[PDB]
Amino acid sequence: SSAIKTTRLAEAIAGIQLYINRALNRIEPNARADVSTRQFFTDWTVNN
Amino acid sequence: HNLSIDGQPLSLAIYAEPTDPKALLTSMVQASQGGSAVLPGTLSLYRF
């Protein structure tokens, strides 16, 4: 809706979080499995 | 749609309350009015 508000950085953060979730959970194809094994995505349970 | 988890709206609405009652007045209306006219008089038989 037009009622809900946000900020530019918050919306960018939410977008990248959504993209990371979709890439890690194998929802989007061809995700680089070698990149998906970094320490950030290994600790993604607290970095999300 | 910016509602709570149970559906309560998160915004307080406004209505712009209707603008007061209306006062009605009456007035006297006057029209042009004429007078009578006079005709030539008869000569009586008696003195003044």
CSV table of N, CA and C in Angstrom, one decimal:
chain,number,residue,atom,x,y,z
A,1,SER,N,0.8,-1.2,0.0
A,1,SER,CA,0.0,0.0,0.0
A,1,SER,C,0.9,1.3,0.0
A,2,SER,N,0.2,2.4,-0.3
A,2,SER,CA,1.0,3.7,-0.2
A,2,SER,C,1.1,4.1,1.2
A,3,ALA,N,0.5,3.5,2.2
A,3,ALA,CA,0.6,3.9,3.6
A,3,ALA,C,1.9,3.5,4.2
A,4,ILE,N,2.4,2.3,3.9
A,4,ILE,CA,3.7,1.9,4.5
A,4,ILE,C,4.9,2.6,4.0
A,5,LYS,N,5.8,3.0,4.9
A,5,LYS,CA,6.9,3.8,4.5
A,5,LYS,C,8.2,3.1,4.9
A,6,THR,N,9.3,3.6,4.4
A,6,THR,CA,10.6,3.0,4.6
A,6,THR,C,11.7,4.1,4.3
A,7,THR,N,12.9,3.6,4.3
A,7,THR,CA,14.1,4.4,3.8
A,7,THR,C,14.8,3.7,2.7
A,8,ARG,N,15.7,4.4,2.0
A,8,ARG,CA,16.4,3.8,0.9
A,8,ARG,C,17.3,2.7,1.3
A,9,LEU,N,18.1,3.0,2.4
A,9,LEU,CA,19.0,1.9,2.8
A,9,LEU,C,18.3,0.7,3.4
A,10,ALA,N,17.2,0.9,4.1
A,10,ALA,CA,16.4,-0.2,4.6
A,10,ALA,C,15.8,-1.0,3.5
A,11,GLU,N,15.3,-0.4,2.4
A,11,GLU,CA,14.7,-1.1,1.3
A,11,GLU,C,15.8,-1.9,0.6
A,12,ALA,N,17.0,-1.3,0.4
A,12,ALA,CA,18.1,-2.0,-0.2
A,12,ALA,C,18.5,-3.2,0.6
A,13,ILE,N,18.6,-3.0,1.9
A,13,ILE,CA,18.9,-4.1,2.8
A,13,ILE,C,17.9,-5.3,2.7
A,14,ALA,N,16.6,-4.9,2.7
A,14,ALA,CA,15.6,-5.9,2.5
A,14,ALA,C,15.7,-6.7,1.2
A,15,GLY,N,15.9,-5.9,0.1
A,15,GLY,CA,16.1,-6.5,-1.2
A,15,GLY,C,17.3,-7.5,-1.3
A,16,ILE,N,18.4,-7.1,-0.7
A,16,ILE,CA,19.6,-8.0,-0.8
A,16,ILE,C,19.3,-9.2,0.1
A,17,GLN,N,18.7,-9.0,1.3
A,17,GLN,CA,18.3,-10.2,2.1
A,17,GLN,C,17.4,-11.1,1.4
A,18,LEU,N,16.4,-10.6,0.7
A,18,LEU,CA,15.6,-11.5,-0.1
A,18,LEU,C,16.3,-12.3,-1.2
A,19,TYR,N,17.2,-11.5,-1.9
A,19,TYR,CA,18.0,-12.2,-2.9
A,19,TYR,C,18.9,-13.2,-2.3
A,20,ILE,N,19.5,-13.0,-1.2
A,20,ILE,CA,20.4,-14.0,-0.6
A,20,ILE,C,19.7,-15.2,-0.2
A,21,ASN,N,18.5,-15.0,0.4
A,21,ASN,CA,17.7,-16.1,0.8
A,21,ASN,C,17.3,-17.0,-0.4
A,22,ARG,N,16.9,-16.4,-1.4
A,22,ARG,CA,16.5,-17.1,-2.6
A,22,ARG,C,17.7,-17.8,-3.3
A,23,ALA,N,18.8,-17.2,-3.3
A,23,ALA,CA,20.0,-17.8,-3.8
A,23,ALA,C,20.5,-19.0,-3.0
A,24,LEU,N,20.5,-18.9,-1.7
A,24,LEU,CA,21.0,-19.9,-0.8
A,24,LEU,C,20.1,-21.1,-0.8
A,25,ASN,N,18.7,-20.9,-0.8
A,25,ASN,CA,17.8,-22.0,-0.7
A,25,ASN,C,17.5,-22.7,-2.0
A,26,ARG,N,18.4,-22.4,-3.0
A,26,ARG,CA,18.3,-23.1,-4.3
A,26,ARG,C,17.0,-22.8,-5.0
A,27,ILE,N,16.4,-21.7,-4.7
A,27,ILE,CA,15.2,-21.3,-5.4
A,27,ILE,C,15.5,-20.7,-6.8
A,28,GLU,N,16.5,-19.9,-6.9
A,28,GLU,CA,17.0,-19.4,-8.2
A,28,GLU,C,18.1,-20.2,-8.7
A,29,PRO,N,18.1,-20.7,-9.9
A,29,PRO,CA,19.1,-21.7,-10.4
A,29,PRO,C,20.5,-21.0,-10.6
A,30,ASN,N,21.4,-21.9,-10.8
A,30,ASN,CA,22.8,-21.5,-11.2
A,30,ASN,C,23.5,-20.7,-10.2
A,31,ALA,N,23.1,-20.8,-8.9
A,31,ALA,CA,23.8,-20.0,-7.9
A,31,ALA,C,25.2,-20.7,-7.6
A,32,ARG,N,26.2,-19.9,-7.5
A,32,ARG,CA,27.6,-20.3,-7.4
A,32,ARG,C,27.7,-21.0,-6.1
A,33,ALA,N,27.8,-22.4,-6.1
A,33,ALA,CA,27.9,-23.1,-4.8
A,33,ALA,C,29.2,-22.9,-4.1
A,34,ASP,N,30.3,-22.5,-4.8
A,34,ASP,CA,31.5,-22.2,-4.1
A,34,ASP,C,31.4,-20.9,-3.3
A,35,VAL,N,30.7,-19.9,-3.9
A,35,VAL,CA,30.4,-18.6,-3.2
A,35,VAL,C,29.5,-18.9,-2.0
A,36,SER,N,28.5,-19.8,-2.2
A,36,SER,CA,27.6,-20.0,-1.1
A,36,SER,C,28.1,-20.7,0.1
A,37,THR,N,29.4,-21.0,0.1
A,37,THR,CA,30.1,-21.6,1.2
A,37,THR,C,31.0,-20.7,2.0
A,38,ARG,N,30.9,-19.4,1.8
A,38,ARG,CA,31.7,-18.5,2.6
A,38,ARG,C,31.3,-18.5,4.1
A,39,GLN,N,32.0,-17.7,4.9
A,39,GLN,CA,31.7,-17.7,6.3
A,39,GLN,C,30.4,-16.9,6.6
A,40,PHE,N,30.2,-15.8,5.8
A,40,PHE,CA,29.0,-15.0,5.9
A,40,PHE,C,27.7,-15.9,5.7
A,41,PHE,N,27.7,-16.7,4.6
A,41,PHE,CA,26.5,-17.5,4.4
A,41,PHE,C,26.5,-18.8,5.2
A,42,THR,N,27.6,-19.2,5.8
A,42,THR,CA,27.6,-20.3,6.7
A,42,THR,C,27.0,-19.8,8.1
A,43,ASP,N,27.4,-18.6,8.5
A,43,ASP,CA,26.8,-17.9,9.7
A,43,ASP,C,25.5,-17.2,9.3
A,44,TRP,N,24.9,-17.5,8.2
A,44,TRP,CA,23.7,-16.8,7.8
A,44,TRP,C,22.5,-16.9,8.8
A,45,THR,N,22.6,-17.9,9.7
A,45,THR,CA,21.5,-18.0,10.7
A,45,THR,C,21.5,-16.8,11.6
A,46,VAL,N,22.6,-16.1,11.8
A,46,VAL,CA,22.7,-14.9,12.6
A,46,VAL,C,22.9,-13.7,11.7
A,47,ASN,N,23.4,-13.8,10.5
A,47,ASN,CA,23.7,-12.7,9.6
A,47,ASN,C,22.5,-12.3,8.8
A,48,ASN,N,21.4,-13.0,8.9
A,48,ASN,CA,20.2,-12.7,8.1
A,48,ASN,C,19.4,-11.6,8.6
B,1,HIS,N,-1.2,-4.2,3.6
B,1,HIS,CA,-2.3,-3.1,3.8
B,1,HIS,C,-2.1,-2.4,5.1
B,2,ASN,N,-1.1,-2.7,5.8
B,2,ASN,CA,-0.7,-1.9,7.0
B,2,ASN,C,-1.6,-2.1,8.2
B,3,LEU,N,-2.1,-3.3,8.3
B,3,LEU,CA,-2.9,-3.7,9.4
B,3,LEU,C,-2.1,-4.5,10.4
B,4,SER,N,-2.7,-4.6,11.7
B,4,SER,CA,-2.0,-5.5,12.7
B,4,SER,C,-2.2,-6.9,12.3
B,5,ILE,N,-1.6,-7.8,13.2
B,5,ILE,CA,-1.7,-9.2,12.9
B,5,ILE,C,-3.1,-9.8,13.0
B,6,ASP,N,-4.0,-9.1,13.8
B,6,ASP,CA,-5.4,-9.5,13.9
B,6,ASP,C,-6.3,-8.7,13.1
B,7,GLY,N,-5.8,-7.7,12.3
B,7,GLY,CA,-6.6,-7.0,11.4
B,7,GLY,C,-7.0,-5.6,11.8
B,8,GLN,N,-6.5,-5.1,13.0
B,8,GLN,CA,-6.8,-3.7,13.4
B,8,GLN,C,-6.0,-2.7,12.6
B,9,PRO,N,-6.6,-1.7,12.0
B,9,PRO,CA,-5.9,-0.7,11.3
B,9,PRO,C,-4.9,0.0,12.2
B,10,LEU,N,-3.8,0.4,11.5
B,10,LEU,CA,-2.7,1.1,12.2
B,10,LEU,C,-2.7,2.6,12.0
B,11,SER,N,-3.7,3.1,11.4
B,11,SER,CA,-3.8,4.6,11.1
B,11,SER,C,-5.1,5.1,11.7
B,12,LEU,N,-5.1,6.3,12.3
B,12,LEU,CA,-6.4,6.9,12.7
B,12,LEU,C,-6.9,7.8,11.6
B,13,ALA,N,-8.2,7.6,11.2
B,13,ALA,CA,-8.8,8.3,10.1
B,13,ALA,C,-9.3,9.6,10.5
B,14,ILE,N,-9.6,10.5,9.6
B,14,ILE,CA,-10.2,11.8,9.8
B,14,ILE,C,-11.3,12.0,8.8
B,15,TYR,N,-12.3,12.9,9.1
B,15,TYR,CA,-13.5,13.0,8.2
B,15,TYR,C,-13.7,14.5,7.8
B,16,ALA,N,-13.1,15.5,8.4
B,16,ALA,CA,-13.3,16.9,8.0
B,16,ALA,C,-14.8,17.2,8.2
B,17,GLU,N,-15.2,17.3,9.5
B,17,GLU,CA,-16.5,17.4,10.0
B,17,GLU,C,-17.3,18.5,9.2
B,18,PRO,N,-18.6,18.2,8.9
B,18,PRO,CA,-19.4,19.1,8.1
B,18,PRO,C,-19.5,20.5,8.7
B,19,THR,N,-19.6,21.5,7.8
B,19,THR,CA,-19.5,22.9,8.2
B,19,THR,C,-20.8,23.4,8.6
B,20,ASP,N,-21.1,23.3,9.9
B,20,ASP,CA,-22.1,24.0,10.7
B,20,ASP,C,-23.6,23.9,10.1
B,21,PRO,N,-24.6,24.3,10.9
B,21,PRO,CA,-25.9,24.5,10.3
B,21,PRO,C,-26.0,25.7,9.4
B,22,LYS,N,-27.2,25.9,8.8
B,22,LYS,CA,-27.4,27.1,8.0
B,22,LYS,C,-28.6,27.9,8.6
B,23,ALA,N,-28.4,29.2,8.7
B,23,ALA,CA,-29.4,30.1,9.2
B,23,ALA,C,-30.2,30.7,8.0
B,24,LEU,N,-31.5,30.7,8.1
B,24,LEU,CA,-32.4,31.2,7.1
B,24,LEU,C,-33.2,32.4,7.6
B,25,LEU,N,-33.3,33.4,6.7
B,25,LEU,CA,-34.0,34.7,7.1
B,25,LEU,C,-35.1,35.0,6.2
B,26,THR,N,-36.0,35.8,6.6
B,26,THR,CA,-37.1,36.4,5.9
B,26,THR,C,-37.0,37.9,5.9
B,27,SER,N,-37.7,38.5,4.9
B,27,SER,CA,-37.7,40.0,4.9
B,27,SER,C,-39.0,40.5,4.3
B,28,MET,N,-39.3,41.7,4.7
B,28,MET,CA,-40.5,42.4,4.1
B,28,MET,C,-40.2,42.8,2.7
B,29,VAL,N,-41.2,42.6,1.8
B,29,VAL,CA,-41.1,43.0,0.4
B,29,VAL,C,-42.2,44.0,0.1
B,30,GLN,N,-41.8,45.1,-0.4
B,30,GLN,CA,-42.7,46.2,-0.6
B,30,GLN,C,-42.8,46.5,-2.1
B,31,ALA,N,-43.9,46.8,-2.6
B,31,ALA,CA,-44.1,47.1,-4.0
B,31,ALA,C,-44.7,48.5,-4.2
B,32,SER,N,-44.5,49.1,-5.4
B,32,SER,CA,-45.0,50.4,-5.7
B,32,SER,C,-46.6,50.4,-5.6
B,33,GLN,N,-47.1,51.4,-4.9
B,33,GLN,CA,-48.5,51.6,-4.7
B,33,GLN,C,-48.9,53.0,-5.0
B,34,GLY,N,-49.9,53.2,-5.8
B,34,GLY,CA,-50.4,54.5,-6.2
B,34,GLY,C,-51.6,54.9,-5.3
B,35,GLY,N,-52.1,56.1,-5.6
B,35,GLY,CA,-53.3,56.7,-4.9
B,35,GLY,C,-54.4,56.9,-5.9
B,36,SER,N,-55.5,57.4,-5.3
B,36,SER,CA,-56.7,57.6,-6.1
B,36,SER,C,-56.6,59.0,-6.8
B,37,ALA,N,-57.4,59.1,-7.9
B,37,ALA,CA,-57.5,60.4,-8.6
B,37,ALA,C,-58.9,61.0,-8.3
B,38,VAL,N,-59.0,62.3,-8.6
B,38,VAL,CA,-60.2,63.1,-8.4
B,38,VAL,C,-60.8,63.5,-9.7
B,39,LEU,N,-62.2,63.6,-9.7
B,39,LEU,CA,-63.0,64.0,-10.8
B,39,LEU,C,-63.6,65.3,-10.5
B,40,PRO,N,-64.0,66.0,-11.6
B,40,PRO,CA,-64.7,67.3,-11.4
B,40,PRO,C,-66.0,67.1,-10.6
B,41,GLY,N,-66.3,68.1,-9.8
B,41,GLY,CA,-67.4,68.0,-8.8
B,41,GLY,C,-68.6,68.7,-9.3
B,42,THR,N,-69.8,68.2,-8.8
B,42,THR,CA,-71.1,68.8,-9.0
B,42,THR,C,-71.3,70.0,-8.2
B,43,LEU,N,-72.1,71.0,-8.7
B,43,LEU,CA,-72.5,72.2,-8.0
B,43,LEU,C,-73.8,71.9,-7.2
B,44,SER,N,-73.7,72.0,-5.9
B,44,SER,CA,-74.9,71.8,-5.1
B,44,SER,C,-75.8,73.0,-5.1
B,45,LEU,N,-76.9,72.9,-4.5
B,45,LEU,CA,-77.9,74.0,-4.4
B,45,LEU,C,-77.8,74.8,-3.1
B,46,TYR,N,-77.1,74.3,-2.1
B,46,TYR,CA,-77.0,74.9,-0.8
B,46,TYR,C,-75.7,75.8,-0.7
B,47,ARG,N,-75.7,76.7,0.2
B,47,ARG,CA,-74.5,77.5,0.4
B,47,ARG,C,-73.4,76.7,1.1
B,48,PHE,N,-72.3,77.4,1.3
B,48,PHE,CA,-71.1,76.6,1.8
B,48,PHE,C,-71.3,76.1,3.2
